[PDB]
Every structure is written in structure tokens, then in C-alpha cells.
Symmetry: C5
Subunit: 384 residues, 5 copies
């Protein structure tokens, strides 16, 4: 006789119709069992709010036409037949915004009771809501909604292959060393409803992914810390040097270029910018405050050859915390030297005031950045 | 007997022709009812003027060959049959400039009266007219024109599934947290005409989308405001410092780099640049005016050792608003000191004039930027 | 009896062969009439010299096998049959460098005389010659060559559906608000020839597109004008300030960064760079000339404490256009003051010369940029 | 009689079923022999951790239905038949994250014993773990896992065509002049297991690729070396020039721009940044230390007209290693000159201290960068 | 009777098998004649070492089953039949690293002797070895290897349609105005061999393409020449100005930014960087040498108020090539003036030395850049 697989396949696929839903009684829906195993988080685009993942998805349903008695076919209990030869449910993801390029699986396993098993890998580009409020430490909760696109609850119902606890803790194949860490996938069944009669089976997997901040620690924190360090170094220049203000403005321009170039990576959304943006703005205010202090002190100590002398209150407050023709003609010589000396001494008194005030405002700025830095490391421990 | 679905499908699809338009009388057009549900605004490219969206589109038409009496087939009233087994109208969008990658839906529902229901998701890349005059606050009105590509009004006519008010206010599935907010989609029926006989059914959906400015507020307004703040800070430097002009030119270079880098995002069109461009140009004029004032005041107060003394009109106008050999040889000594002192005093008089004029032109510039800023916040309230 | 469309389609498509060219006499070529309607200029890549457009293309040919008498089929005069069921000529564009993603049109109209009408939209990526000599105002003349890829003049000949004047002035559907304005499309028929026998039908449409310069006016002209304005402002700084040369070099660095960033947009070709490049180089020469004048004047007026006094010719040319021990020991005091005063006066004389020469060379540079600017606006009026 | 190939193909492919696994006894698995020949490493994306390669992959299995006696068919021993006409195992790579665009091979060779030979080229985009710890010199070890997607060990088993030593040392077609050098590919057989019964054949090829550092030597090392050279040159400027600190800050800004622009190429991962990042940070610390030394020395030698004189310990430590009205009125003149001279001499003493300390701290910094450079060249020899 | 084309096609394609290689005797290989006509060089990616071209490729082979006597079919000598209806050899390019998007040609010409003619355009992405040693003037020699992927020499042999001299000089359709100029394509036949029996036909076309340097002359040479010009201008600033060193460092930073931005275009390879990189490094050394000369001269002439006087050897070498209380108290006044004057004169002597040495080192640098520029223009003439 002929081989068992040839006889079995010829018996099953003879006068078999792919278009008909395989039920002998049309009132019975084909319950399809869904299982999803996350393999990789290929991309998370916050600008377009799209998530590209790869999953291994296996489903099984009872085909009431692909049934046989194994004892009549040399005790064969299951066989593989082409996917395009049998009816396959139109179960797909609601959140699609594209089609994913994935290998086509040509065969499906069929058991002697009709239990067709369809294993396939598929790449999904799905629209998801991304909360970028705490960008470097954000936890994204994206829904993949498997449902029959056309058939209602009365034709195709969806159940879960494994128990929800098993699929929740499944990380057997996930590519872990990416930017995103898979926390869990959470299945939940519900019915979509257009009206009373048009109700659709639905299975939502809540893929939860946490961003790894070690990708971005160097990218954001290190340059800003450098800039603050150099700013703190810049106060050691004397206020009367004239280069100190140029130093400060050059540093501000550099950190502004840093902000501009970083903004191509730091994303944004309509709900609001990440708190990293707020801390960058606070760093900006700190640098602008340092520049304004430098400019004020430069205005204070300038050798402008016009200064009235320091007022008594200012002086005390600062220093508490620090032959007749020949005779008359020589008098003009000493008067001009005295006029220059008195003017020069006045400029020194302003310089003496401006030096210690530069020191005093350096300590306050030193403490202000110290309090700000300790506040940041405290909040980081909470996010960590 | 055989199962109802097998018998029904075999009866319907036997000697069924896909190429023929399913009408028993060829004079009757197949009225196709169109429904469009916007799911996401994937992209709006102003440079190329193309809009990429995703829609859920459902249509239904009466197939006069897919009719049966349910009482003869075990009371089955509707069944799903493959899309590629039956005639499907060639209804597509006129504004296509590409093909969208969308899932292929294999099945369609058919009721016992022949009412075929085709549900499918599709991504559309369509040419649209984008008015970028008020870029951060623009409201775009893009037309999606569903029509039968080949069949005229005498073969395929297009109606609307739901009432126009229902489709106008449909936001049940729209992904809202993107850059674009869907205001409404507006359906309108009209007939395209090549001649008297060649008239085509047409249904234009006017997708109206408003850009969310919170994406761009930080991107444009914040750096410019920073630059103006630093410019205002720069006036506190003394005019005779010599660094003030370097400060101003460095700031101008920084803001020019800001303009250059921002222009990769701020789009343009043949109709005209956005008013944001005009306000950036006005900010540019303000910075150039501040730089010119700095350069003029520096030219005024310079210690050039060549100045003639301040004219009487200028002085008043500004200050209203603020042994014989031994004897003759010593006279040369006091004369040279007097010559230096008189020259030094003249330089001081120019400095006294230039100081208050720097203050006076600082107040005017302070008020000019204040009036400009209040004007901007007033117009923003209207756009908001 | 059966419906007319079913009977007609069954009669036509029974024993119909798609592979055969539909002529009862094989000597008669199938004359295909071509019509092209430009819809959008999607992209013009000057770097790769490729033009991506979208067209609505309709063709019609006489199929001698799809003929019937309408009075025998309930007076049906035309019917739509699937495109993949009948012979379709292999007419495509010679200039292809890719395949365009375009919707597939499933049906074609067939009249009772056999006149098959095939309407289809198609995106074309075609190699074209782009003359970038006058880049902002260039008029590109790109050829789309529709021809039968395989069949010679003896099998497929190509004619034009409409008169050439009608297709020349066709702008009914063109998307006008893009960067490119369609001037006309010009059809011309010719025969390609490999040898005497192997001659091919050919129809060249000369798509002529003019770039809209309002896209680029802001992008190129405005920043350069700004830079020149600031350069003109920079001369007001005194030559002895020392900051003027730093101002000029900073401005030159800024405009060089402008040139670098702009070059990512301004294209180039082997024939030659656009004249915009030449005018940018002339602006570069103007800025370098201003910098060299600043450096020369700074070298002239420096307080170098070493200057020999101004020569008589230079002075006139410039100013035409502007007790014994006690006695001897006091003499040394007045001599040292005289030595310093004479040296100081010499430095003033050089400064007096350098000041007016700075003014004189400022007027010449002011006129040179004025002549250059008026020359540019004159040539712009010709291009406009 | 008919030609041998026609008769043989007609005999083989008559009543041949593609869906059945070609075994006369269904208990016998189809052992498929796998061979992989690497052709090119198209891309290694460290950001997404994906490897795109091209391979020539040949497989062979025994088809028990495609068997014939050559003496009955004119001594034909093998023939090519279309790939889509016979059963082909569903062997693919587990690590897929996309589908590769590769030519479709239409034919396969079949020998008279049934040995089908399938040669095909395929592009693979596979997820791989990339260790970027020593980025310029890293050796990546990426797994390509060929397995039957559906069939278990009981239906399809996988062996190796050639001996493992032959495939390990195979570089016959590899494109060598790319960025990556193929060290070896290592085959290893194992069984995947879902449970006791569901075990799958598996063949892992460990493609080992070493990056060529000559691509990146110029990109990273050369600019940093330049920056250090210029920094070393900058110490030759006198500390009192005032421009030295501006020189240092400008150099620091330039090298920071270098770091920013380079970071678009230097990748990162969650495990940790490459040691090149650590050496760049050490270079950053060196530049900041040089800037701080410059600022400290500038603070030390400033002509601030306020300095108390150098303390005795500091001085020694540094220098070890380097008519009554007329009479009284003239006394004021010499006193004022003495007051200025003593103040001027004090400023000189501070300058004398700061000069040699600048030299002394220049030698230490010269030795520190020398030790750092020699340390780098030593470690480079180990990596080389 | 029926039309000739219908009868002929029905006679030929009845019981015609596509899978069989069309030979009546299986020992006779099907000699396929190859012809390749280059149409465009779409892209040359030196980073990935891939060449994307477009070719018109025509092949012809003798099909021994598609033969007829024309006198029996109304004297028809050739006819077009669908490509997918007849056997087509699996000839493709070995160097594929992708699949090219090209139009599908549906028909092929068949003559009455069986000579099938297959014309088709195809885009090829092929791995090629790119020698970037002389990047702007490089001549690339890339191999396209047409061979039968599966069939050996015993089944499919490959010959050339035209004589090798005709295909060598073929430029009839090449798009010439691109970046690459096609010098020639060179065909050569060889046999690949796996073993003694498994030998494969092979035809290598050596596409030779020369880069047009006019694309890049402006891109590289012009900015560097500008930078050198400005550097030469910078020497005219006096050494004691203090701004000269700032000028030089700003220029160096600008040219470094130029190098950084240019490196995104100038490619690299493992064999070695292009000589343009070496000349850029030499320009870098020239700028660093100019900066070091400026810093040295600034160190030489500084008004540091500490200089010992110029040594006798240095001076000559440089200048060869250029009442008791009242009496004693007045003596202190002249002594202090003498002390200041002698110190001031010493600073002048150092300035006199440093001025001419700046001139002398300017001439040497002027000649060094002149020799370097003449050397470059000489080598350019050889490359040109
Ligand atoms: C008002 C309204 C009516 C029906 C729907 S449903 C839908 C609409 C178009 C295309 C497909 C569907 N679906 C049906 C089953 N579920 C998958 C998608 C909606 C959303 C609104
Ligand atoms: C002058 C003219 C004639 C006919 C048309 S129509 C058209 C033309 C080519 C291809 C398709 C069409 N269409 C027919 C039905 N509507 C969808 C597209 C035009 C625009 C101008
Ligand atoms: C020397 C030569 C011979 C023939 C041609 S033609 C050609 C060649 C290959 C593939 C296609 C064609 N074509 C035939 C009909 N026209 C469309 C393209 C040439 C150019 C040179
Ligand atoms: C818990 C668990 C169960 C089964 C698998 S396997 C798998 C799952 C879905 C789709 C395909 C597969 N495969 C089967 C044979 N090998 C190739 C892929 C896993 C991973 C976990
Ligand atoms: C060791 C070795 C054996 C065979 C080959 S050949 C080859 C291998 C796999 C897939 C295809 C081929 N080819 C056969 C005919 N020529 C085109 C490609 C090699 C390279 C090494
Ligand atoms: C099938 O299995 C049964 C036991 O399960 C055994 O008795 C019978 O012999 C088997 N048939 C064949 C053909 O092996």
C-alpha cells in the first residue's frame, strides 16, 4: 500500500475547502488559543510613538475536518501540512501602524483530533502610548491587542494557551542586552462591542518595558557635570582680569551647544517634557547666574577712572568681614601726583570691596551648586 | 448531510465568476457604502507635502450572486468567505503618492441578501496641501478622495455607510497622544467628470488636524528667550571694558548657530515662511541693534589719546540728565604733567558722556524688548 | 437566461489566451495609444540625478479577440474585466533606475469593438540630467521614454491618445504647491534602432519643471546679507581697540560655519558648481578683504613704542584730506619726560594717519559692497 | 521516444505531493545536512545589537519519492527540478529580527537516490550580543541558529554537510576588505526542548568577527593627540599675558566639540562604555587640570595693585630653585614715586614666583602626559 | 482557420514543461549567451564597499522544444510568449549582497529555431573592492560575475553574445553626467570548480569606473586654501598685540571644525586612508607650526617687566640683518625715572629683536607654504 503520510494527506485534503470555517455545526465558534513570547524590543520611537518588537506567536484551534483515526493510517497521530492548504483564522493586532517583515512559515502541525498548531515569528510595528515624564528611568506599558479582524464572538473566540502566570513571567528567549528590559507581558481577555450583536473576541498583552539608564548616564550627566566643574574653576580668575567674563560667556556658549546637540536624543511629547529638561533648565539658570555675578563684579571693580569713593556704610560692612614762583610751581607737580594717587587709591578701595564680595558670592554659589548636586543624587537613589 | 457552511459555500462559489460585476441587470450600478475611521496620523512631511495616516476602512455592497435562502442551509444567515474568491470594487484614494504597507485581510462577511462587508486597515501616503503660515499653531485640512479608479457612475456609485454627523465626530480609536490632534473628518459626495458620459463617483473626507504647540514651545521659544536675557545682562558691562563688544559678538554668533540648527525643523513653503521666521528675524534685528549700540558707545568712550573735548551742547545736554634757568626748566615739568592731565580729563569727560548714554540707551532697549515681549504674549493668547 | 455580464464574460474569456498578441493577422501591430498626466513631483535628487514623480497613465489598444455584438448580450456595449485575464502590452519607461510603489489596478474597460482601456497610477524613479548651473532658478528638462521593452515596431507601435497640444498644457491634477512648478510635458515620437530590422516604437515626454526660488531665498540670501551687515557695522570700532580684529575673525568663522552648513543643501555636479557658489566665494573674498584691511590698520596704528615718526610725504598726503649739580639733575627729569612725550606724540601721529585711512578705506569698502549688492539685485531681476 | 528529462520529470512529478514529508516510513526523520559559507559582514549595528550578514547556504536531504533507476531513463543520474515543485524543509534561523532580501533560487538538483541539493544565498538580519568593552579591538561572537521552525527531532533532524574542521576554516568567498575580519564559524549540534517529547534539532554556527582598528585609529586617536600637542604648546605663553587662559578655554571648547561629534560613532551598551570612553575622560581631566593650573597661575601673578608682598618662606623656597617748605614738598614727590615703585616691585616679586612655578608645573604636566602616553602605547601593544 | 499566433502558441505550449531543461539529449548543455549594457552607476558606498548599478541585460539560449516550421503557421518566424511559461536559466550575479528592485519583463521572443531572447533591466547591489588610496582620483575595478547558481558546466554553459571588443567600448545608454565615468566593462570567461566534476560556467564583467574630481575640488581644496590664506594674513598683526595668538587659535579651531565636518564625506578603509588625509595632516602641521611660532614670538617680546637685557651675541646677530638734602632728594626722583626708562628701553630691545625675527620667520613660512603649494599643483597635474 501507499505510505501513511501520503494516504493520510490525500484523505484529509481531498475535497477540503479553505474558505469554510471548520465546524460541523456553524453555531460553534472556533476557539483559538493564543500564546505570545517576546523575543526582542527592536525599536521604541518616542517621536512617532511607535514600538517595533519581535515575537514568537503560536496558536492552536480545533479543525473539525482534519480528523482521522490513527489506527487506519499506520498509527500516525500527527502530521505537518502546508499552512496555505487549510483554514487559518485572521487573528492580528489592532495597534498595527505598519506591516512587519517576518519569515513565512509554510507548515502547520495537525493532530488526529484536528488540533492544528501554528507556530510563527512576526515583527510588529504598533502604536503605543509612551510616557516620557521620567525619560531616563521611564517604564513603558504598551498594549498588543490580538483579535480576529472580521469574525465576531459567534465565529471566532480567543483564549490563552498557557496560564496567565506562565506567560507573565516568560523571559526564556528575550534578548536582554538591549536598551529595554522586559518586566512582564500581561494577558487580559475582553470583548470589543460595536453593538449588542457585533461583539469581538480580544486579548490584550500589556508588554511592560523599563529603559536602562546606563545607556544615557554618560550621554547627559557627564558633560553637564564637566561644565559645572569648569564654571566653578572659573571663579578663581581675578575679577579685574577682564578675561573672566569672556571665560564665562565662552563656557555658556559651549554648554548651549551641548544642549542643542543633546536635544536630538532627548525626546518630547504633548503631555510634557521630561524632568531632565527641567534639570537642564536649572543648570542653565545656574550658569546664567554665575555669568551675571561675574558681570556685576566686573562692573564693580572696573578701573574706569571715574569712580566716586566707596561709601562709608559699604566700606565698613565689607571690611568687617574681609622763590615764591618756584615754591608754587613745585606745588602743582605734587598736586598732580596727589590727584593721580588719590584717584588710584579710590580704584583700589573699590577693588578691595569687589575682591571679597567675589569670594563671598563664590561661597554662596559653591553651596548652591552643592545643595543642588546633593538634591539630584538623592532623587536619583529613589529612581534607582 | 454535509455541514451547512460547506454546502452553502459550495453552492455560492460554484461557477462563480470574480471578473463580472455582480448585478443581474447590468444597468444597475453597485452602490458601495464607504466608512473611514482615522486611527493615527503617522507623519506629516511639510517639505514633500505628504501625509501618512492609518485608517480602518469598511465598505459594503450588494452582490446579487451571493444570495441564498437561510432555511435551506440550516438557518445560516451570514458566512465569511475569502476576499480573493469574490468580486471586490477597485475603490482607492486619488491622492496616493505611494503604496502603504498594511495587513491583508483574507475574509469578508456575506449576508443572505448578498450584502458583502469588507473590513480592512490601510496605511495611506497621500499628497496634501499644508499651510505653514502659522506653523506651531497651524490647522491642516487634507483631502482623502475615495473613488473607483476605473468604473464610472454607471457601474460603481459611492455612498456613505453612517450619517455624516456620525463620521464627523468619530474619535473612538484615534491615537491622541501624537503631535497632531484630529479635529474631525468631513465626508462630501461629488462627481468627477471627464466629459458628459465619463462621470465618476467620488467621496472626499476632509481630515482636519491641529498641531500641538507644546511639542515646539521648548524647541523655539526657550532658547531665544535665554539669548535675549543674556543680551540684557550684557549691558551691565562697562563700555570701556573692551570685552563688552566681544561678549555681544559671541552672543550673536551663538544665536546665529541656534537659528542655523533650528532651521532643520522649522519648515518652509512657496506660499511663504511661517510667522515664526518673521519673529526670529525681528529678534535678529534686536540683537544686531544691541551690538551696534555697544560698538557705537565703545567708539564714543575710547581712550584714543586723540579726542578733542566734548562740545558745549553735548556736555550740557548730557549733564542735565546725568635761577631763571631753574624756574623755566621746572615749568616744563609741570607743563608736561598738565598736558597729560588735561588730556586725561578730556578722556574722562567723554567717558562721563558715554556712561549715561549707555544707561539711557539701555532703558530704551529695555522698553523695546519689553514692548516686543508683551506683544508676543498678547498674540499668543489669540492663537491659544 | 443568465445575466448579460456573465454570458458576455464567459463568451469572451473562454479559450482566451493571454500570451498571444491579440491580432487575427500577425503582420498587424497593436497600436497602443499613450496618455500621461503628471500628478506630483515627489523628489528631485541632484546628487544622484534621479527624479521621482507620480503620473496617471492611461493606454488603449484594440484587442481583436475581445469583440462581440452588443445586440446579442442585452445591448451591453462595454464591460470591465480583470487586468490579469487579458493580454497587456509591456510598455514601460527606459529611464527607470528603480521600481515605483504604486497601487495595482485590477480591472480594465473593454468596448464591443475590442478597445481595451487601461487606467493606472504609477510612481516613476527615472534617471535624468539636471543642470544646476543656476540652481535657485534652474529649469530642468527630464525625459520619460515610454516604449515596449521587448516588442519591435512590427509588433507594438505607440501613438498618442490626445493631441500633443492638449497634453502639453495639461495641469488638471498636478499638485502645484510643491517646490517644483510643472511648465509642460512635451510628447515626441521616434524609433529606436539596434539595426535595420530591430526598430522599436518610442514616445518621449519631456517633463519641464521650474524650481520655485522662494523656498531658498531665506535659506541662502538672508544669512549672508546679515553677515555683510555686521561686517559693515564692525568698521565703527576704533582700530586701536584691539577687539576689532577679534570681531572680524569671529565674524569670518561664523560665516564659514554658515558656508559649511549650507553646503549640505546646495548641490553640485561635474559640469560645474552653481553661480550661487561663485557669489558665496565673492562674499568670502569681501570678508577676507575686510579682515585684511582691519589687520593692516591695526599694524599701522599700534602703540608699539618703537615707531619712527610719520614720513613727510605720508603726513602731508593724509592731513590734506583729514647749583650746577641741581640745574643739570633737574634737566634729566625734564629730558625723560620729553623723551616719553615725544615718543607718545609720535604714536599719536601714526594714530591720526590710521584713523582717517580707516575712514577712507571704509568708504571704498562701503561703495564696493554697494556696487556688488546693486549688481546682484540687477541680475536677480533678469532671473526673475 | 520522448527525451529522457521529459520522461523522468513526468514520472517523478506525477501524483507527487509537496505537503507530505518524503518518507515511506513516517517514523524515519528526514536528516537535512547543513552547510554555511560566510560571504560578507554587511553591517554590525551596536545600538540595536543586530548583525546583517550574507551567506551561501546549501542543504541536502533524501527524498524517498524522487527516486528512479537511471538505466530506464537513458542513464540520467541527476536532474534539476523547480524548488516550488518538491517538499522543502522549513529550516531557518532562530535569531531573525527581520527578513533579508535575497535572490530566489528556482531550481534544485536531485540525484537518482533522491538526494535533493538546495543551494541558495540569503541575507540574514539576526539579533546578536555585542561586547563593546574594548570597542576598537573587540571580537564579536554571534550565533546563527539553524533549526526547523515546526518539525521536531522526530520529523526533521539536522546534521552537518562537511566536517566541522572544514567549515571552521572556510574563507574561500568571504569579502575580506571590510571593517570586520572573519576569524571562524563554529558549528555545534544541540537539541532544543520544550518538554520531554517536543525536542527540536538545532545547529549553532558561532560566527566570530574581529573589528579592524585601522578604520578608527585616525578617527579617535589623531585629533586627541593634536589637542594634547596644542595644550602642551599653550604653556609657552607667559602667565601674565591674559590671553593664555582664553587660549586654554578655547582649546577645551574645541576638544569638547570633538567629544560631542565623535560620540555619534563611539557606541555604548548597558554592560558598560568602552575603555576608549575612559581614556577620553582621562584626557578631559588632563585638559581641565591644565586649565586649572593656568587659572591658578594667572590668579597668582596678576597686576592687581593690591598684593601684599611675597612671604619669606615662599620667597626663599621659590628662589632656591629659580627752604623748609621746598624741602618737604619735594619729599612728597619722591615719596609718591617711591610708593609706586615699591608697589611695582612687589608685583614683580609675585611675577618672579609665578614664572618659575609655571615652569615647574609645566615639567610635572609634561611628565604626567608622557607617562600617560607611554602607558597607552604599552596597552596598545597588548591589544595589537 | 484560427489565427497563426493562437495556433502556434497552442502548439508550442501544449504539454510543455517548464521544469525540464529544454534539450532533447540531456548530455548537451544549454549554452546561454550573455550581454550586459551599463545604464547608470546608482551608488558607490565605500563604507560598506557596495556598488549599486543598473544594467540592461539580454540573454539568449536555444530551447529545443519551442521549434516549429513557419510555413505551417502562416509564415510566422518569431513570436513573443510569457516569460513565466517557459524554462529560464537561473543565471545571476555571485557578488549579490541584496536584491535590486527592477521591472519584471513579462514576455520573451522566441524564433522558429527555438532561439529564446530574454531582455530585462536589473538593478544590482554587489560587493566590490574599493581602493580609496587616491580618493578624489581613484579608478575602481568592480567585478560582476554572471553564473548559473545551480547548474554546472554539464547543464548550463555561458558564452558572450557580442564580441568582447564590442562590449568593452559600449557606452550607448550610460548616464554620463553622474559622479562616476564608465571607462569600460571587460568580459572574461572562466570555470569555477568545487571539485573535478562540479565545475560551473562563469562570466566576469570588470566594470571600471573613474571618479570625477570636479565634484570634490570645491569640497576639499577651497576651504583649506582659504584657511591657509587667512593664516598668512594673520602674521601681519604685531607680535605684541596679544590678539595675534587669539587670532591663530581661533583659526586653528575653525580649520579643525572643517576637518571634523569634512570627515563625514572623506571615506576610509582598512588598507589605508587616502592621501588627501595625509595632505590634510600636513596642513594641520603647518597651522600648528604657525601657532607655535606666534606663541614663541609672543613669549619673546612680552612686556613682562622682568626681562634681563638682550645678550650681546643675540643683539649683534639680529641687528646685522634688521642744600645737600635737596640735591640728594632730587637725585632719587631722577633715579626712579632712570630705573623706569632703563627697564622700558630693555623691553624695547627685546621688541626690536622679536619684530624682525617675526619677519624672518614669516618669510621662511611663506616659502614653506609656497613650496608645499607648488608641490601639490605638480602632483595634481600627474593625477590629472
Ligand atoms: C463606529 C465604529 C464601527 C465599527 C468599528 S470596528 C472596525 C471598523 C472598520 C474596520 C475594522 C473594524 N474592526 C472590526 C473588528 N475588530 C477589528 C477592527 C469601529 C471602531 C467604530
Ligand atoms: C484630460 C484627462 C482625462 C482623463 C482624466 S482621469 C484619469 C486619467 C488617467 C488615469 C486615471 C484617471 N482616473 C479615472 C477615474 N478617476 C480616477 C483616475 C484626467 C484627470 C484628465
Ligand atoms: C548594442 C545594443 C544592443 C541592443 C540594445 S537594446 C536592449 C538591450 C538589452 C536589454 C534591453 C534592450 N532594450 C530593447 C528595446 N528597447 C528597450 C530596451 C542596446 C541599447 C545596445
Ligand atoms: C514556553 C515556550 C513554549 C514553546 C517555545 S518554542 C516556540 C514558540 C512559539 C513559536 C515558535 C517556537 N519555536 C518552536 C521550534 N523552534 C523554533 C521556534 C518556547 C520558546 C517557550
Ligand atoms: C567548500 C565550498 C563548497 C561549495 C561552494 S559553491 C556554493 C555553496 C553554497 C551555495 C552556493 C554555491 N554556489 C554554487 C555554484 N556557483 C554559485 C554558488 C563553495 C564556495 C565552497
Ligand atoms: C498500532 O498500535 C497498536 C497499539 O497501540 C498496535 O496493537 C498495532 O499493531 C499498531 N499498528 C501498527 C501497524 O503498527
Amino acid at each position: 500500500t501507499q505510505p501513511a503520510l501520503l494516504r493520510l494527506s490525500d484523505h484529509l485534503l481531498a475535497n477540503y475547502k479553505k474558505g469554510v470555517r471548520p465546524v460541523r455545526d456553524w453555531r460553534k465558534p472556533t476557539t483559538v488559543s493564543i500564546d505570545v513570547i517576546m523575543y526582542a524590543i527592536l525599536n521604541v520611537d518616542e517621536k512617532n510613538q511607535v514600538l517595533t518588537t519581535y515575537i514568537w506567536y503560536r496558536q492552536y484551534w480545533t479543525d473539525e475536518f482534519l480528523q482521522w483515526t490513527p489506527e487506519d493510517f499506520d498509527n500516525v497521530t500527527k502530521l505537518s501540512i502546508p499552512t496555505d492548504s487549510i483554514w487559518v483564522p485572521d487573528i492580528l493586532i489592532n495597534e498595527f501602524v505598519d506591516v512587519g517583515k517576518s519569515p513565512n512559515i509554510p507548515y502547520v502541525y495537525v493532530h488526529h483530533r484536528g488540533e492544528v498548531q501554528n507556530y510563527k515569528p512576526l515583527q510588529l510595528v504598533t502604536a503605543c502610548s509612551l510616557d516620557i515624564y521620567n525619560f531616563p528611568f521611564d517604564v513603558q506599558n504598551c498594549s498588543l491587542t490580538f483579535t480576529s479582524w472580521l469574525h465576531t464572538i459567534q465565529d471566532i473566540n480567543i483564549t490563552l494557551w498557557r496560564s496567565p502566570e506562565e506567560v507573565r513571567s516568560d523571559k526564556s528567549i528575550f534578548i536582554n542586552q538591549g536598551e529595554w528590559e522586559l518586566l512582564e507581558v500581561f494577558p487580559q481577555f475582553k470583548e470589543f462591542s460595536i453593538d449588542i450583536s457585533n461583539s469581538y473576541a480580544e486579548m490584550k498583552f500589556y508588554v511592560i518595558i523599563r529603559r536602562r539608564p546606563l545607556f544615557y548616564a554618560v550621554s547627559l550627566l557627564l558633560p553637564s557635570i564637566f561644565l559645572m566643574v569648569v564654571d566653578i574653576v572659573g571663579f578663581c580668575l581675578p575679577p579685574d582680569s577682564g578675561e573672566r567674563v569672556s571665560f564665562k560667556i565662552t563656557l555658556l556658549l559651549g554648554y548651549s551647544v551641548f544642549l542643542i546637540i543633546v536635544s536630538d536624543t532627548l525626546p518630547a511629547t504633548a503631555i510634557g517634557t521630561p524632568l531632565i529638561g527641567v534639570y537642564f533648565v536649572v543648570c542653565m539658570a545656574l550658569l546664567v547666574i554665575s555669568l551675571a555675578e561675574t558681570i556685576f563684579i566686573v562692573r564693580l571693580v572696573h578701573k574706569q577712572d571715574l569712580q566716586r569713593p566707596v561709601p562709608d556704610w559699604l566700606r565698613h560692612l565689607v571690611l568687617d568681614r574681609a622763590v615764591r614762583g618756584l615754591l608754587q610751581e613745585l606745588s602743582s607737580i605734587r598736586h598732580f601726583l596727589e590727584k593721580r594717587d588719590e584717584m588710584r587709591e579710590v580704584a583700589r578701595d573699590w577693588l578691595r570691596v569687589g575682591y571679597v564680595l567675589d569670594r563671598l558670592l563664590f561661597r554662596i554659589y559653591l553651596l548652591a551648586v552643592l545643595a543642588y548636586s546633593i538634591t539630584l543624587v538623592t532623587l536619583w537613589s529613589i529612581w534607582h
